[PDB]
Amino acid sequence: DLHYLSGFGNEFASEALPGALPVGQNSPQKAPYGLYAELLSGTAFTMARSELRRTWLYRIRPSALHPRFERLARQPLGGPLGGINPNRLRWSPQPIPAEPTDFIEGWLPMAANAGAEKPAGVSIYIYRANRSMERVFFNADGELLLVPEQGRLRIATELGVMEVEPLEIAVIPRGMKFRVELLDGQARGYIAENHGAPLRLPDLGPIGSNGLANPRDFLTPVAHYEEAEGPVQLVQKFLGEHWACELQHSPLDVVAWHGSNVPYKYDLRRFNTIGTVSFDHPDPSIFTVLTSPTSVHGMANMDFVIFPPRWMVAENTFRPPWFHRNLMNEFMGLINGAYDAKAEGFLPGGASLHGVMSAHGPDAETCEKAIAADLAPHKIDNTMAFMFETSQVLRPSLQALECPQLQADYDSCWATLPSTFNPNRR
Amino acid sequence: DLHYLSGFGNEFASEALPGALPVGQNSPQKAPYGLYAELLSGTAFTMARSELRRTWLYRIRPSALHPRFERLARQPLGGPLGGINPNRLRWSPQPIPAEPTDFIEGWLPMAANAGAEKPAGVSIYIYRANRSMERVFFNADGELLLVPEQGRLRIATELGVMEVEPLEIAVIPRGMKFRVELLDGQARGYIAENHGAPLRLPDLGPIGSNGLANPRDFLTPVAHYEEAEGPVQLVQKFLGEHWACELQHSPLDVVAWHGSNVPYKYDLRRFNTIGTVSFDHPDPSIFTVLTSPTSVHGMANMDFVIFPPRWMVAENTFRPPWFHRNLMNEFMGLINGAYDAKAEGFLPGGASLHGVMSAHGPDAETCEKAIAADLAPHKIDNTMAFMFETSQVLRPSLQALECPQLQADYDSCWATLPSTFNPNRR
Amino acid sequence: DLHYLSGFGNEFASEALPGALPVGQNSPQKAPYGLYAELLSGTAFTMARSELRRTWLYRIRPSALHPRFERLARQPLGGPLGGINPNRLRWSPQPIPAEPTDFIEGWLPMAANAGAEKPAGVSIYIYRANRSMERVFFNADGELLLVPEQGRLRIATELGVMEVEPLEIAVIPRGMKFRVELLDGQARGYIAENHGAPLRLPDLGPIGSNGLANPRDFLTPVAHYEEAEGPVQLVQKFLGEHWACELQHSPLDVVAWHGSNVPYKYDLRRFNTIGTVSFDHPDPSIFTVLTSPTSVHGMANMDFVIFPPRWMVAENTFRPPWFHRNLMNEFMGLINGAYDAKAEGFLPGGASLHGVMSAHGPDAETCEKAIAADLAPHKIDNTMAFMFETSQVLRPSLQALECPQLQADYDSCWATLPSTFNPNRR
Amino acid sequence: DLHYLSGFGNEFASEALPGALPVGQNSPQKAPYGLYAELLSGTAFTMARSELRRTWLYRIRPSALHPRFERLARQPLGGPLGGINPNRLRWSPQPIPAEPTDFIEGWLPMAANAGAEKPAGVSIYIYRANRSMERVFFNADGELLLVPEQGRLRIATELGVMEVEPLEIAVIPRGMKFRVELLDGQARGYIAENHGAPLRLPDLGPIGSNGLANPRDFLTPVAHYEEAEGPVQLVQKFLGEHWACELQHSPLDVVAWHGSNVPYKYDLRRFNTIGTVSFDHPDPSIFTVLTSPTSVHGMANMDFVIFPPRWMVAENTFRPPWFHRNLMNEFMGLINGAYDAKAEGFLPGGASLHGVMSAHGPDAETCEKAIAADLAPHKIDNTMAFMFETSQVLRPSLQALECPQLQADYDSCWATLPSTFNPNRR
Ligand SMILES: O=C(O)Cc1cc(O)ccc1O
Ligand SMILES: O=C(O)Cc1cc(O)ccc1O
Ligand SMILES: O=C(O)Cc1cc(O)ccc1O
Ligand SMILES: O=C1C=C[C@H](O)C(CC(=O)O)=C1
Ligand SMILES: [Fe+3]
Ligand SMILES: [Fe+3]
């Protein structure tokens, strides 16, 4: 099977041929095997070492060997920004379109902080694919966080091949070349496109030096190169547009590499979930897998949080999520099973958006159940929900608002919430 | 019953006579009721507001009205530091001496970062008392963290009266005047004398904005003044020594006050305990109640950590603390019940010291029962252990090393750990 | 000739008349010589002293003495932003236009982070002028970094006169009034208009306390005032537009001044160039002259880097710049001679732009040459190339995309790059 | 021949048996092979992830299985602090003593910031040994930087085996157990014992993302374990003292480990030396290999700096080090050949100490030669010197001051400096 290197943020080193990596230097005059040294600077040169993301590649042909890029006619992301809407929104799962749509062609824009033409913050999509990619792609607009829901993915990147299935997540750095093979014929899932500071592990605070997503579970592929003599289309996403050129070699021609700006996968089943071992309901930030910070300490660009199988032990407490109003913007998804807060309507591939200060919380069915529950240890199982929480307002696209999937009467799930107040009895 | 004000770090305002607090200013020419304004600056003037600790007092006589202080012949903290000793140490509970001993006379130095003459870091004591104080006291050397184990205390402070029982903790700010009364004739407990940055709530990291010790549970007494017309001794602890003077008035004459440098109490039963809801054994920093930082970010002067009733749900996990070697210094106490990592020898009022890089962990019996047990939800109850963890090495006092309470064969609790290793069977 | 004060960041003091500057105060009731005190606040009042830029002026007439500003018909920066383009671009040198064109009228927008009406980050222009200014100008949108390529400039500012020639650079702070006279009748060069944090010297890190651009080399003009009666046009650049009013006096009427918000010039020939004394090719951030930071530590708004005469000693290394893909956006200019990585097509006055993740590096002919070359100490001389590197995307203007100077087949320079890969010979 | 893992600061994973590391957790109830989990916390739990140093160990027997430590009769560093001496000091190399002396018995205290009983900052020693260790050791006092000068070392640590030779450096974390075997029968070299923040790579500033000591050149050994039952002395250094206990098993019984608290080695010949490619003499901080910071930003507890083979190209410059007076304290050592600033008397194994504000610089011979030589590019070679620069004062021990190797006429190396001042000729 495919091999991997472990350790989030490590200075990795990988060669497909022995001695392909130069020893004791980055730029020899005549590189082993007659390879070309190339530097991929994922961060500004002057970043603190802790923030540094850079990889040295030793390849057959320089990435510079390409003709002029031309705008393609076929622009999945060229749709308008939907009109202003403060309502709580919920979508049913997205159907796979009948027309041939590969991985890059199938990104349906759901909600974003800014227009595709001026990338800032986070852009959220749902991908629907029915074709494997017969081209190579790189995103100039940001880091890609992939959340499969339906079907396995075999992702051929410049640094190696990774296999990603639902219940796992994968990250592609900005500008890195990749090609998506659909192993099950069709694929559906979620994407967080990070335009900001790279995703990293959260500051654990009192949790200390261990817990949540343990760095040892972040897997990076080993060196792997191709040698195809012939035309291969290279596509790039630039300011929301797809631009392409034809190469006469495969751009996945990296024989060896070393550095820290790498693609990676992580299995969510390995999450060391922390929670209440006493009473009350911890803030959902406790379930943080990865985070993208801003220059405002403590206020993330986005937080990727999961709602995984876990033990529920809170005594004399209302166990489902509390009623909530938040400065932050809450985009919810579902990979497997059902979510603890919504009795009906939220299915795998579905989505919910509770924007800035929009009043949310449990439905009446969940409320009645929880207040009547005989509280004893209970293990939540066979489920995996997640949230992409952003600091900037998420603006739904015109496409997601005109979407047949956008539920018509979502507000009705809270309509049957009764008054239980009696001032004459504490 | 005593009344209290809630909220860790609040700018409180309290008056025993209506209008005693000047409205709209701190320093009127003619203060209401003929009282005197006095500022107790708990920090440098230029500290960030988040770190600011100062209280304005409106009192019958200024603190400045006192004769010269005289050095007392009786000095409970006059013994020198013990000899260099890297061993793992355990003491049985300290008996209460027969000789008349009040709260300030009853501190037994256990271990400290420095000699009493040059206060730095933390100094740890165990107090034993059989008399209520017939004098008033203030500590110029540091903040006092009080952990009662036996007996109830009535602490009359300059800002008011607070009652503390075992399972509660109390903090007295540096230089604040107080008198301790024994409600049950005798009293025993632990003291963390903080010479550094004042104790405060830990930054929660992913736990978020709620959890661990909630700010609403930190209670400060309401204004209360005494009016006894007789000679009162005022004692101060300076550079480890007890110095005294005689007053003709009561120094607990604060009629009204406002500010943030306050005495407070906290009930440990209200701690919102956070832990594993999955597997593994979280780092004990997760149990932080209060912490004193240093200028080195993330490395505290001391952490006040508890081991309270909690749900144990970790699946296919060694539940007791893992075997450990730590940069930090671990001093443990026990208020009630029995502790997780130790089968015998550790009793309420007892103590343990595992210094820098000393090899500690669960004793042999504990280790054995944990590996063979059938795992299921289990509630640890009717117990409360704690730790004073210090970044600086804790040097036990000569009195603590020469103590008949120091256990002779502490090392034997690990003596029977067996090799269960078989390189042919995973 | 012209006299200058030295020392980057100094609290300077200059006076055209004896005692014109008030002693021991900034705002006397009766100023010396009957002058008016005026505060020029370059930063918010509350900035840390290290970041503060402010200058007190002692002038004949306050700056407030002006009528309403009117919008001019001539608007050289009103041109729209070009279409989205990810391609690598290279412009041949810009011709001086035939029409009367002064310094502020001759700015050709090349690439900018945002539209002119909403200034953000950095805006890049190539200036072409054939007339001296017969008016006084101030830019309200940001700080101007001037890089002369042809012709000397005599820049008369409110704080004095400074002369600048190719191989020197000049900075004029935002809001400061100035008038450009062309000493050689015509001029051309580059401009980096900084809309963010003022340019400053780089944090040296391991280079230490000396090196790169030494502070003693940053020269500020001495106080110089004018008293010419009649109509003077005062122009200001506000949200990309030129607005003007008519004054009856000369606005360069500052008799004395003191402070840190000053125009300055630096000779690039005095750069204490640091590099490799062993092997490899150091990141070009090592040649940083000046930098504008952002809120994100380590990620600059812009870095002004130079590629100056220098010793090349790296043994067993590929000496020209490595092949590169960067998060940053690289705008290159040329003052004299030729640049190391480009064999032909890049001339003095020319420009290149390699945007976010665009694949760049040495052209085919230099790559062939460097691999074969016998490595010996070699002094790169008779050259001065530089870079404006920006964190935000640089959008070329419509004009820069339709310019006859825009080289149609820049991509061909890398077309002949061969594969020298041999998988059977390391 | 030994296997290594590369990458300074990586989250490493190594197993001597397949599947010996638990998958997806740290604390299984039944660990693979019947091994014990044990955590080695190198830092406080709450440090920022960039500062975190911790290693999970999977061992045959917990480190806790040890009897009481007893104070050894032989005490290499119980000697008193030398008296006050501000003088510039120079020692000739240390001869190996005739009495059987293993690595830990042969530490000659040279200079330190504090008394051995109160470790703080850094302690410097020269090691001299004629015997391989027939015991296992750990230092509870500090991290150890080893700088071999004569003879090869084979260091068996808890995480595995590493071989160090002169021109290589090796670091051993605080509390980590190790045994030194002398490959040449006898060995001599320097030691910097860091009692403060762990050494790490310096912030590169303008050097950027690569250069100096590249992280790929930092090698950690692979997992290795010992089985041999029988008596073995375990020795610890605690507050300057050697304490011991007897174990009935080898303590180097780690079958598998993962983490970032690791011993490592680095080959100085791999240093990507940066220096002037123009003129002048860069500050020596430019040669930093590793640094231990303080809470004061920019002021290190210590900097380990090297003076390796390098190109000297500075034009019209005095090339040797400039005459200097420093707040910092300069301790120099020599591994191979001769050092540039001193013609004679500074031999390999020698040392110099120029304390706070002591006036140093090149000797008279080097001074004349450098003012007469016709400047051409020159390769310094066949040499390797270094410096331990500390912020706190370095007090020499009584042994180093009473030492026959202390040169009584060091001040005479400067005695012959002439006055070349000629007011009549610039
Ligand atoms: O269920 C939701 O909509 C999200 C959510 C989860 C949680 O654990 C607490 C609050 C919250 O709003
Ligand atoms: O039992 C102890 O001494 C303290 C301790 C507690 C814990 O939860 C984990 C490790 C540890 O050493
Ligand atoms: O030639 C370039 O485009 C600029 C450049 C300079 C350098 O030293 C390293 C890399 C690089 O891209
Ligand atoms: O390159 C250097 C510059 C100044 C210093 O004093 C040193 C140390 C000295 O040689 O003793 C080295
Ligand atoms: Fe919410
Ligand atoms: Fe511990």
Ligand SMILES: [Fe+3]
């Ligand atoms: Fe580049």
Ligand SMILES: [Fe+3]
């Ligand atoms: Fe020096």
